Amino acid sequence: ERPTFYRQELNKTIWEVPERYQNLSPVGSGSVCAAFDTKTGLRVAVKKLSRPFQSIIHAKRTYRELRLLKHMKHENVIGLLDVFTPARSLEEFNDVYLVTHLMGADLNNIVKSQKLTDDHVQFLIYQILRGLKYIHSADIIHRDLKPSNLAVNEDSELKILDFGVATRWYRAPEIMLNWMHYNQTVDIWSVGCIMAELLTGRTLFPGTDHIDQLKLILRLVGTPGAELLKKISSESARNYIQSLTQMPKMNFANVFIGANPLAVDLLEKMLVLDSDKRITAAQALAHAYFAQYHDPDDEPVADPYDQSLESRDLLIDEWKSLTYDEVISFVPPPL
Ligand SMILES: Cc1cccc(-n2nc(C(C)(C)C)cc2NC(=O)Nc2ccc(Nc3ccnc4ccc(N)cc34)cc2)c1
Ligand SMILES: CCCCCCCCO[C@@H]1O[C@H](CO)[C@@H](O)[C@H](O)[C@H]1O
């Protein structure tokens, strides 16, 4: 039975939440308050979705995020503690609030404050890969992995999230090249870029645009081979590649001066241009670099996820009814 809600106005924005959530305090831009979950004891983030049914793009996005977060159940992936609306019927349904564990800092804050030890990088990259094995096993590709999409607490425990520094800096070259298809290993490229930055304290590929971005990448990994050229479906992309002055692959050891050679070797297996040859998250977890963490009995996979549902062509009112149903059917986690 519906809980008692209380209204209050914060940061230019209304908030109507169950009395279960106390001491709401804004933490920025939808928009988010920190709160105390009186029921469970936990500090929470309550995210109020921004104009969730504004358009078919917003309505679909709202549905997709709710559906996904409800399905994510893993230590290294953001999970849903609660989802609510102050509306007591579909007819008055306009607002969606998502609740998750409050997060202190993102990886940016840790590397922008420091440069990390190899021990610390092992543990953080291990966890990103473990969460990705899970996400990937559900046939979900993150596509926007970057330090700010990684929450890290005081215990160095890490969770992958998607909050929505350029995204381009962490993006696999095939995305720069507007490839229509791409596999799960686009996310491995990003982990490669993140791990590099954590080990050196510098953005590996700080491109100013997409062409510059490819320039900086090819400078390290070398221009495509004849085996890779054969795999390019775009006549226009294919021409551009063949028009380049060949650059050789660099020796990563000669670039990541001082880093652990196993870290370097792992980077060599992640930052491969041919994505068919890039290491997968599950193979990565078994690399010698993660020897002290890797446990094949404790790196679980996800239940299968149906992406067709969020991809349909429906009316705003229909996405809205579908989102309402997802709110109503929420089953909370065990505390
Ligand atoms: C926008 C969108 C649409 C569809 C899916 C996602 N998405 N996808 C994922 C995975 C499963 C692929 C990794 C996760 C999400 N969504 C997501 O992470 N949502 C989310 C909710 C709240 C937050 N905000 C905060 C969460 C926790 N603490 C915070 C502290 C301060 C602050 N300013 C914000 C937060 C960040 C992300 C995101
Ligand atoms: C200069 C940049 C070269 C781009 C090479 C990226 C990897 C190309 O390799 C291809 O990746 C595609 C996307 O997943 C897939 O369709 C193919 O399975 C794969 O052969």
Side-chain angles (χ1 to χ4, degrees), residues 27-28 32 45 47 61 64-65 68-69 72 77-78 100-103 135 140 142 160-164:
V27 284
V32 183
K47 187 186 169 205
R61 172 171 309 118
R64 181 178 182 259
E65 185 172 22
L68 253 184
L69 288 175
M72 295 294 95
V77 185
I78 194 160
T100 70
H101 287 118
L102 185 54
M103 287 144 322
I135 284 171
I140 296 158
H142 183 112
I160 303 168
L161 53 68
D162 205 344
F163 255 107

Short mmCIF file of all heavy atoms in Angstrom, two decimals, residues 27-28 32 45 47 61 64-65 68-69 72 77-78 100-103 135 140 142 160-164, ligand 1:
data_model
loop_
_atom_site.label_atom_id
_atom_site.label_comp_id
_atom_site.label_asym_id
_atom_site.label_seq_id
_atom_site.Cartn_x
_atom_site.Cartn_y
_atom_site.Cartn_z
N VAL A 27 22.84 17.35 -4.57
CA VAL A 27 24.23 17.11 -4.94
C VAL A 27 24.50 17.39 -6.43
O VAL A 27 25.54 17.02 -6.96
CB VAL A 27 24.71 15.70 -4.53
CG1 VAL A 27 24.97 15.64 -3.03
CG2 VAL A 27 23.68 14.66 -4.91
N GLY A 28 23.57 18.09 -7.09
CA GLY A 28 23.80 18.57 -8.45
C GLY A 28 22.87 18.00 -9.50
O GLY A 28 21.89 17.32 -9.17
N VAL A 32 19.66 15.38 -8.38
CA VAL A 32 19.94 14.38 -7.36
C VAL A 32 20.04 15.00 -5.96
O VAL A 32 20.72 16.03 -5.77
CB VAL A 32 21.28 13.64 -7.68
CG1 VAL A 32 21.60 12.52 -6.67
CG2 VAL A 32 21.26 13.10 -9.08
N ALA A 45 21.31 8.15 -2.87
CA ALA A 45 21.09 9.20 -3.82
C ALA A 45 19.69 9.02 -4.41
O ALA A 45 19.32 7.92 -4.82
CB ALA A 45 22.16 9.16 -4.93
N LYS A 47 17.55 10.27 -7.44
CA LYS A 47 17.59 10.96 -8.71
C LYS A 47 16.18 11.21 -9.24
O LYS A 47 15.43 10.25 -9.52
CB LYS A 47 18.38 10.15 -9.72
CG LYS A 47 18.64 10.88 -11.06
CD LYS A 47 19.29 9.93 -12.04
CE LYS A 47 19.34 10.48 -13.46
NZ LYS A 47 19.41 9.32 -14.42
N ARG A 61 13.97 6.55 -23.16
CA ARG A 61 15.17 6.61 -22.29
C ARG A 61 14.85 6.33 -20.82
O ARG A 61 15.63 5.63 -20.14
CB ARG A 61 15.90 7.96 -22.43
CG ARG A 61 17.06 8.16 -21.41
CD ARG A 61 17.91 9.37 -21.70
NE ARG A 61 18.31 9.35 -23.10
CZ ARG A 61 18.00 10.26 -24.00
NH1 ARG A 61 17.30 11.35 -23.66
NH2 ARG A 61 18.41 10.10 -25.26
N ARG A 64 14.02 2.66 -20.66
CA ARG A 64 15.23 1.87 -20.81
C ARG A 64 16.06 1.86 -19.55
O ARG A 64 16.58 0.81 -19.14
CB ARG A 64 16.10 2.32 -21.99
CG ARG A 64 17.35 1.46 -22.17
CD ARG A 64 18.21 1.89 -23.39
NE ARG A 64 19.35 0.99 -23.51
CZ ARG A 64 20.59 1.26 -23.11
NH1 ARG A 64 20.90 2.45 -22.59
NH2 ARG A 64 21.56 0.33 -23.26
N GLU A 65 16.22 3.04 -18.94
CA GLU A 65 17.04 3.14 -17.74
C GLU A 65 16.37 2.35 -16.61
O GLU A 65 17.05 1.62 -15.90
CB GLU A 65 17.25 4.60 -17.31
CG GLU A 65 18.22 4.67 -16.12
CD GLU A 65 18.65 6.05 -15.75
OE1 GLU A 65 17.94 7.04 -16.08
OE2 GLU A 65 19.69 6.16 -15.07
N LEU A 68 16.67 -1.45 -17.33
CA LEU A 68 18.03 -1.88 -17.08
C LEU A 68 18.44 -1.94 -15.62
O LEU A 68 19.04 -2.94 -15.18
CB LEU A 68 19.07 -1.03 -17.81
CG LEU A 68 19.81 -1.57 -19.00
CD1 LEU A 68 20.82 -0.53 -19.42
CD2 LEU A 68 20.46 -2.89 -18.64
N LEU A 69 18.22 -0.84 -14.89
CA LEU A 69 18.68 -0.80 -13.51
C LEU A 69 18.00 -1.89 -12.65
O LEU A 69 18.61 -2.40 -11.73
CB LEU A 69 18.49 0.60 -12.89
CG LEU A 69 19.44 1.72 -13.39
CD1 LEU A 69 19.03 3.04 -12.78
CD2 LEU A 69 20.86 1.43 -13.05
N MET A 72 20.03 -5.08 -13.19
CA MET A 72 21.43 -5.15 -12.81
C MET A 72 21.65 -5.58 -11.35
O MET A 72 21.33 -4.85 -10.44
CB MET A 72 22.11 -3.79 -13.00
CG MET A 72 22.20 -3.27 -14.44
SD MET A 72 23.27 -4.30 -15.45
CE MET A 72 22.17 -5.41 -16.24
N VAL A 77 28.34 -3.09 -10.41
CA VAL A 77 27.43 -2.37 -11.31
C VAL A 77 26.44 -1.67 -10.41
O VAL A 77 26.03 -2.24 -9.40
CB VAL A 77 26.69 -3.27 -12.29
CG1 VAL A 77 25.84 -2.41 -13.30
CG2 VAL A 77 27.70 -4.12 -13.07
N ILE A 78 26.09 -0.42 -10.74
CA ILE A 78 25.05 0.28 -9.99
C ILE A 78 23.76 -0.54 -9.94
O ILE A 78 23.31 -1.12 -10.96
CB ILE A 78 24.77 1.67 -10.59
CG1 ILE A 78 23.95 2.53 -9.62
CG2 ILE A 78 24.18 1.56 -12.08
CD1 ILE A 78 24.05 4.03 -9.92
N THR A 100 19.44 4.91 -5.39
CA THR A 100 20.60 4.07 -5.39
C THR A 100 21.47 4.43 -4.16
O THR A 100 21.22 5.43 -3.44
CB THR A 100 21.47 4.28 -6.70
OG1 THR A 100 22.09 5.58 -6.67
CG2 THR A 100 20.66 4.17 -8.00
N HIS A 101 22.50 3.62 -3.94
CA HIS A 101 23.53 3.90 -2.94
C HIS A 101 24.19 5.22 -3.27
O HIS A 101 24.45 5.52 -4.45
CB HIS A 101 24.60 2.81 -2.99
CG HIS A 101 24.17 1.51 -2.41
ND1 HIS A 101 24.11 0.35 -3.15
CD2 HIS A 101 23.81 1.17 -1.15
CE1 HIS A 101 23.71 -0.65 -2.38
NE2 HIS A 101 23.51 -0.17 -1.16
N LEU A 102 24.42 6.05 -2.25
CA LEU A 102 25.06 7.33 -2.44
C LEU A 102 26.48 7.04 -2.85
O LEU A 102 27.09 6.10 -2.35
CB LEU A 102 25.03 8.19 -1.17
CG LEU A 102 25.55 9.64 -1.22
CD1 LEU A 102 24.86 10.48 -2.33
CD2 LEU A 102 25.38 10.35 0.15
N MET A 103 27.02 7.83 -3.76
CA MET A 103 28.42 7.63 -4.03
C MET A 103 29.29 8.86 -3.76
O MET A 103 28.95 10.01 -4.06
CB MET A 103 28.65 6.85 -5.34
CG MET A 103 28.27 5.34 -5.15
SD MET A 103 27.51 4.39 -6.50
CE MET A 103 26.40 5.56 -7.25
N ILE A 135 27.91 -7.30 -17.30
CA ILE A 135 27.11 -6.47 -18.24
C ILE A 135 27.13 -7.12 -19.64
O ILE A 135 26.06 -7.35 -20.31
CB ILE A 135 27.75 -5.03 -18.21
CG1 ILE A 135 27.32 -4.29 -16.89
CG2 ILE A 135 27.29 -4.17 -19.39
CD1 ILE A 135 28.12 -2.90 -16.71
N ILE A 140 24.79 -6.50 -23.21
CA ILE A 140 24.68 -5.05 -23.08
C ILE A 140 26.10 -4.51 -23.23
O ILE A 140 27.03 -5.04 -22.63
CB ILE A 140 24.08 -4.69 -21.72
CG1 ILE A 140 22.61 -5.22 -21.62
CG2 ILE A 140 24.18 -3.12 -21.39
CD1 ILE A 140 22.14 -5.39 -20.20
N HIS A 142 28.28 -1.00 -22.75
CA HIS A 142 28.16 0.26 -22.01
C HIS A 142 28.29 1.45 -23.01
O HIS A 142 27.44 2.30 -23.05
CB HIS A 142 29.25 0.34 -20.91
CG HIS A 142 29.14 1.57 -20.07
ND1 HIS A 142 28.79 1.54 -18.74
CD2 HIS A 142 29.28 2.87 -20.40
CE1 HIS A 142 28.73 2.78 -18.28
NE2 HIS A 142 29.02 3.60 -19.28
N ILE A 160 30.30 0.40 -11.77
CA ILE A 160 30.05 0.98 -13.09
C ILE A 160 28.67 1.60 -13.11
O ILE A 160 27.66 1.00 -12.69
CB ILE A 160 30.16 -0.10 -14.17
CG1 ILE A 160 31.55 -0.77 -14.11
CG2 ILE A 160 29.90 0.49 -15.56
CD1 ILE A 160 31.62 -2.04 -14.93
N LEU A 161 28.60 2.83 -13.60
CA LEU A 161 27.29 3.47 -13.76
C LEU A 161 27.26 4.23 -15.12
O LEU A 161 28.20 4.15 -15.88
CB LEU A 161 26.95 4.36 -12.52
CG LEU A 161 27.98 5.40 -12.09
CD1 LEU A 161 28.00 6.40 -13.18
CD2 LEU A 161 27.53 6.14 -10.85
N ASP A 162 26.19 4.94 -15.42
CA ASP A 162 26.15 5.75 -16.65
C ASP A 162 25.44 7.06 -16.21
O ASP A 162 24.25 7.12 -16.05
CB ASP A 162 25.44 5.00 -17.77
CG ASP A 162 25.86 5.43 -19.20
OD1 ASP A 162 26.47 6.50 -19.41
OD2 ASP A 162 25.50 4.72 -20.16
N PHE A 163 26.23 8.08 -15.96
CA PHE A 163 25.74 9.38 -15.51
C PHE A 163 24.88 10.05 -16.54
O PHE A 163 24.19 11.00 -16.23
CB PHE A 163 26.89 10.28 -15.17
CG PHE A 163 27.07 10.45 -13.72
CD1 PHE A 163 28.13 9.84 -13.06
CD2 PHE A 163 26.16 11.21 -12.99
CE1 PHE A 163 28.29 9.99 -11.69
CE2 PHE A 163 26.31 11.36 -11.64
CZ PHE A 163 27.38 10.74 -10.98
N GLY A 164 24.92 9.52 -17.76
CA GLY A 164 24.11 10.01 -18.84
C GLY A 164 24.20 9.01 -19.96
O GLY A 164 23.84 7.84 -19.78
C1 LIG B 1 20.67 7.73 -18.74
C2 LIG B 1 20.68 6.23 -18.82
C3 LIG B 1 19.77 5.61 -19.69
C4 LIG B 1 19.77 4.21 -19.78
C5 LIG B 1 20.63 3.47 -18.96
C6 LIG B 1 21.53 4.08 -18.07
N1 LIG B 1 22.36 3.29 -17.35
N2 LIG B 1 23.00 2.32 -17.84
C7 LIG B 1 23.73 1.72 -16.85
C8 LIG B 1 24.65 0.47 -17.05
C9 LIG B 1 23.90 -0.73 -16.44
C10 LIG B 1 24.88 0.17 -18.53
C11 LIG B 1 26.02 0.59 -16.34
C12 LIG B 1 23.49 2.40 -15.70
C13 LIG B 1 22.60 3.39 -16.03
N3 LIG B 1 22.06 4.38 -15.22
C14 LIG B 1 22.66 4.99 -14.14
O1 LIG B 1 23.79 4.71 -13.78
N4 LIG B 1 21.94 5.89 -13.43
C15 LIG B 1 22.34 6.73 -12.45
C16 LIG B 1 21.51 7.19 -11.44
C17 LIG B 1 21.98 8.18 -10.53
C18 LIG B 1 23.26 8.73 -10.61
N5 LIG B 1 23.69 9.69 -9.72
C19 LIG B 1 24.27 9.46 -8.53
C20 LIG B 1 24.28 8.18 -7.95
C21 LIG B 1 24.88 7.95 -6.72
N6 LIG B 1 25.45 8.96 -6.06
C22 LIG B 1 25.46 10.20 -6.58
C23 LIG B 1 26.06 11.22 -5.84
C24 LIG B 1 26.09 12.51 -6.35
C25 LIG B 1 25.51 12.82 -7.58
N7 LIG B 1 25.55 14.09 -8.03
C26 LIG B 1 24.90 11.81 -8.33
C27 LIG B 1 24.88 10.50 -7.83
C28 LIG B 1 24.10 8.28 -11.65
C29 LIG B 1 23.61 7.31 -12.57
C30 LIG B 1 21.56 5.49 -18.01
#
